Amino acid sequence: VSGYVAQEKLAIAERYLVPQARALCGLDESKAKLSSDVLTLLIKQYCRE
Amino acid sequence: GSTQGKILCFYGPPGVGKTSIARSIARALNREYFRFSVGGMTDVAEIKG
Ligand SMILES: Nc1ncnc2c1ncn2[C@@H]1O[C@H](COP(=O)(O)OP(=O)(O)O)[C@@H](O)[C@H]1O
């Protein structure tokens, strides 16, 4: 297995990561939306790994 | 809703009141207090047994 491209992390995190952590805090999407724009800013800036 | 976890740390020069606020929060939330130093510990018998 390899690493991941900057854009690639977006398609991961919107599906396979965000809902999981949403189940960790026990909320549903109805009250805690997180747009794509927040995700691209996150991965582009705050985490280079 | 429910209680939620997160870990937290305070840091600064010794004796700033770190542990003091710890216990103060412990009696704020009403949770029980228990210090556990781990500076320089090595053996696994004191952590896992
Ligand atoms: N704002 C504050 N209010 C009350 N006590 C303080 C404050 N700042 C520092 N102290 C004092 O600093 C000392 C440090 O204690 P503590 O936080 O319990 O452990 P540590 O030495 O690891 O910081 C305590 O005796 C405490 O009274």
Curated annotation (Swiss-Prot), chain A:
Species per Swiss-Prot/TrEMBL record: Homo sapiens
Record note on domains: The Lon N-terminal domains are crucial for the overall structure of the protein, maintaining it in a conformation allowing its proper functioning.
Coiled coil: none
Biological function: ATP-dependent serine protease that mediates the selective degradation of misfolded, unassembled or oxidatively damaged polypeptides as well as certain short-lived regulatory proteins in the mitochondrial matrix. Endogenous substrates include mitochondrial steroidogenic acute regulatory (StAR) protein, DELE1, helicase Twinkle (TWNK) and the large ribosomal subunit protein MRPL32/bL32m. MRPL32/bL32m is protected from degradation by LONP1 when it is bound to a nucleic acid (RNA), but TWNK is not. May also have a chaperone function in the assembly of inner membrane protein complexes.
Protein name per the record: Lon protease homolog, mitochondrial
Tissue specificity remark: Duodenum, heart, lung and liver, but not thymus.
Quaternary structure, from the entry: Homohexamer. Organized in a ring with a central cavity. The ATP-binding and proteolytic domains (AP-domain) form a hexameric chamber, while the N-terminal domain is arranged as a trimer of dimers. DNA and RNA binding is stimulated by substrate and inhibited by ATP binding. Interacts with TWNK and mitochondrial DNA polymerase subunit POLG.
Full-protein positions shown: 658 to 706 of 959
Superkingdom of source: Eukaryota
Disease annotated for this entry: CODAS syndrome: A rare syndrome characterized by the combination of cerebral, ocular, dental, auricular, and skeletal features. These include developmental delay, craniofacial anomalies, cataracts, ptosis, median nasal groove, delayed tooth eruption, hearing loss, short stature, delayed epiphyseal ossification, metaphyseal hip dysplasia, and vertebral coronal clefts.
Subcellular location: Mitochondrion matrix
UniProt record similarity statement: Belongs to the peptidase S16 family.
Swiss-Prot record, chain B:
Subcellular location: Mitochondrion matrix
Classification of source organism: Eukaryota, Metazoa, Chordata, Craniata, Vertebrata
Function recorded in the entry: ATP-dependent serine protease that mediates the selective degradation of misfolded, unassembled or oxidatively damaged polypeptides as well as certain short-lived regulatory proteins in the mitochondrial matrix. Endogenous substrates include mitochondrial steroidogenic acute regulatory (StAR) protein, DELE1, helicase Twinkle (TWNK) and the large ribosomal subunit protein MRPL32/bL32m. MRPL32/bL32m is protected from degradation by LONP1 when it is bound to a nucleic acid (RNA), but TWNK is not. May also have a chaperone function in the assembly of inner membrane protein complexes.
Coiled-coil segments on the chain, per record: none
Subunit structure: Homohexamer. Organized in a ring with a central cavity. The ATP-binding and proteolytic domains (AP-domain) form a hexameric chamber, while the N-terminal domain is arranged as a trimer of dimers. DNA and RNA binding is stimulated by substrate and inhibited by ATP binding. Interacts with TWNK and mitochondrial DNA polymerase subunit POLG.
Tissue expression as described in the entry: Duodenum, heart, lung and liver, but not thymus.
Organism: Homo sapiens
Family: Belongs to the peptidase S16 family.
Record text about domains: The Lon N-terminal domains are crucial for the overall structure of the protein, maintaining it in a conformation allowing its proper functioning. The AP-domain (ATP-binding and proteolytic domains) has a closed-ring conformation in the presence of AMP-PNP and its N-terminal entry gate appears closed. Upon ADP binding, it switches to a lock-washer conformation and its N-terminal gate opens.
Protein name stated in the entry: Lon protease homolog, mitochondrial
Full-protein residues shown: 512 to 560 of 959
Disease: CODAS syndrome: A rare syndrome characterized by the combination of cerebral, ocular, dental, auricular, and skeletal features. These include developmental delay, craniofacial anomalies, cataracts, ptosis, median nasal groove, delayed tooth eruption, hearing loss, short stature, delayed epiphyseal ossification, metaphyseal hip dysplasia, and vertebral coronal clefts.
Residues binding ATP: G12, P13, P14, G15, V16, G17, K18, T19
